[PDB]
From Swiss-Prot:
Domain Albumin: 1-185, 186-378, 379-576
Binding site for Cu cation: H2
Disease with which this protein is associated in UniProt: Hyperthyroxinemia, familial dysalbuminemic: A disorder characterized by abnormally elevated levels of total serum thyroxine (T4) in euthyroid patients. It is due to abnormal serum albumin that binds T4 with enhanced affinity. Analbuminemia: A rare autosomal recessive disorder manifested by the presence of a very low amount of circulating serum albumin. Affected individuals manifest mild edema, hypotension, fatigue, and, occasionally, lower body lipodystrophy (mainly in adult females). The most common biochemical finding is hyperlipidemia, with a significant increase in the total and LDL cholesterol concentrations, but normal concentrations of HDL cholesterol and triglycerides.
Protein name from the UniProt record: Albumin
Residues engaged in binding Ca(2+) 2: D12, D254, D258
Effect of K559E: In Church bay
Pfam families the UniProt entry points to: Serum_albumin
């Protein structure tokens, strides 16, 4: 139980989940170690766990699993020449070794793209040896996303195995492996982005910000529960996410399972939508728990104009317990406003706290904090107007032209950012309105704002490793709920000097013809970024015309033979375009 925690985790999780989580953690710590070494290490660790559970008396079983994992790491690929910076920390002792391991994670490693072999030969390996294939999939997915959510990865591996075991042999093997695998990889990428948001926010801004976010989201999702129940759920969720985001995986999965069991047991006092999918295995049950839809609010709640303003001793209560009072206010406000974004509710709570602090010690506190609710009008009006105009622009322009427009806008805003990361950020920003602008004018704001925040956190975390601009970091490290107000309030950067000209970058080849549509669009957008950076003062219509003619010739002289004529024509066009800005 409490003694020899490895045995406790082995009983609570089981051999299969134990091995899977151990492999995931090993892959996440070391991102260049070969697969065979990872499998051998996992087998050794699980054999040691079996020995520990067989007899709870061995001296090594007393030690925490953390130092055991660290010691097993410092056996191969860590002290063996490679990873010189890791070898220096490998010689250190706990808990400094764990800190070095966590702070050395690479968000974007220099690793080859997945090959995706031919379907028949790909799942004939599954038919030959399913366990090795699943382990390889887990290792490959954990490599590229060191901050991915492990129980979600277990669920993804389970569904992946289900897909192969159902229709690798039935009929038309491609008819599964195109759509099902594409959907699975898209969902995995989205979950990786969300979990990176959560871990980055927690690590950067402490657990108070994460507690506030959890309170807001849980109260939005569970508007019928009492404050104590929501606080208990928030505490459990905060502990779980702190465990996963700090490199402790097994206990994180165990606590997630415990929380899911508690919620599906206490359904009666939480909400009414949980009845649908508590009668199913653990992994997808927790998947519901982390994804269940909102619930209808209680009928005829108070107006909040008597519980937070009219009371004479309101900030006497605030000073009695600041955190408790702010949590109560945030819970009530998110309960009464399910159509507001989570970050918007956090911003409103911050504004309320700021004004309450600014006016509770003057002559007449009420004279200040009487009109507190009237300051929320612009704070909620601005995002609604911005999303309205964004949907207006996107609907009549199409996804690709929306990507181009967002790309030119954010290239004007922050030119110093690197070209590929800027292209990726703009692509995701366009995907925001591609995915959840079709909603009615009652649910656009939550999804739109949340996905915009996710994409902007991706931008900040990609830029942080190589700080190059004096504004992106300046207010990506300012506030967590003030990233989108930054990137929507940034002015056109006139300080940026024009870049030098390089006709080789703009020149195209037959690769644009031999590649798919996605890589073609990516190359065109990269050329757009370079063109905008070269001439930052060009009007939007000029850029639109230049890219329209760009598409024109790349669609005209791609299909034709004697490509040298295409090269000469595009070179003369480049000369003309540089002459005409």
């Amino acid at each position: 139980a409490h003694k020899s925690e490895v045995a406790h985790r082995f009983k609570d999780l089981g051999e299969e989940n134990f091995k899977a989580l151990v492999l995931i953690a090993f892959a996440q710590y070391l991102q260049q170690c070969p697969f065979e070494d990872h499998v051998k290490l996992v087998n050794e660790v699980t054999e040691f766990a079996k020995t520990c559970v067989a007899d709870e008396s061995a001296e090594n079983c007393d030690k925490s699993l953390h130092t055991l994992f660290g010691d097993k790491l410092c056996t191969v690929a860590t002290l063996r020449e490679t990873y010189g910076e890791m070898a220096d920390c490998c010689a250190k002792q706990e808990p400094e070794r764990n800190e070095c391991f966590l702070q050395h994670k690479d968000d974007n490693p220099n690793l080859p793209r997945l090959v995706r072999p031919e379907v028949d030969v790909m799942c004939t390996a599954f038919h030959d040896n399913e366990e090795t294939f699943l382990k390889k999939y887990l290792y490959e997915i954990a490599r590229r996303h060191p901050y991915f959510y492990a129980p979600e990865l277990l669920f993804f591996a389970k569904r992946y195995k289900a897909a192969f075991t159902e229709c690798c042999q039935a009929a038309d093997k491609a008819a599964c492996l195109l759509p099902k695998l594409d959907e699975l990889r898209d969902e995995g990428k989205a979950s990786s982005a969300k979990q990176r948001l959560k871990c980055a926010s927690l690590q950067k801004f402490g657990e108070r910000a994460f507690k506030a976010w959890a309170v807001a989201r849980l109260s939005q999702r569970f508007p019928k529960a009492e404050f104590a129940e929501v606080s208990k759920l928030v505490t459990d969720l905060t502990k779980v996410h702190t465990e996963c985001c700090h490199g402790d995986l097994l206990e994180c999965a165990d606590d997630r399972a415990d929380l899911a069991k508690y919620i599906c047991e206490n359904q009666d006092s939480i909400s009414s939508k949980l009845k649908e999918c508590c009668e199913k295995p653990l992994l997808e049950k927790s998947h519901c728990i982390a994804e269940v839809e909102n619930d209808e609010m209680p009928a005829d709640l108070p107006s909040l104009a008597a519980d937070f303003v009219e009371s004479k001793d309101v900030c006497k209560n605030y000073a009695e317990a600041k955190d408790v009072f702010l949590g109560m206010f945030l819970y009530e406000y998110a309960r009464r406003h399910p159509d507001y974004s989570v970050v918007l509710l956090l911003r409103l709570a911050k504004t309320y706290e700021t004004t309450l602090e600014k006016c509770c010690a003057a002559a007449d506190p009420h004279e200040c904090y009487a009109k507190v609710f009237d300051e929320f009008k612009p704070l909620v009006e601005e995002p609604q107007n911005l999303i309205k105009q964004n949907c207006e622009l996107f609907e009549q322009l199409g996804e690709y032209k929306f990507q181009n427009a967002l790309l030119v806008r954010y290239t004007k805003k922050v030119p110093q950012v690197s070209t590929p990361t800027l292209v990726e950020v703009s692509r995701n920003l366009g995907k925001v309105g591609s995915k959840c602008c079709k909603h009615p004018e009652a649910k656009r704001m939550p999804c739109a704002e949340d996905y915009l925040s996710v994409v902007l956190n991706q931008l900040c975390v990609l830029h942080e490793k190589t700080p190059v601009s004096d504004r992106v970091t300046k207010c990506c490290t300012e506030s967590l709920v003030n990233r989108r107000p930054c990137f929507s309030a940034l002015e056109v950067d006139e300080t940026y000097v024009p870049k030098e000209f390089n006709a080789e970058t703009f020149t195209f080849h037959a690769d644009i013809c031999t590649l798919s549509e996605k890589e073609r669009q990516i190359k065109k957008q990269t050329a757009l970024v370079e063109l905008v950076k070269h001439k930052p003062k060009a009007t939007k219509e000029q850029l639109k015309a230049v890219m329209d003619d760009f598409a024109a010739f790349v669609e005209k002289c791609c299909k034709a033979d004697d490509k040298e004529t295409c090269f000469a024509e595009e070179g003369k066009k480049l000369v003309a375009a540089s002459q005409a800005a």
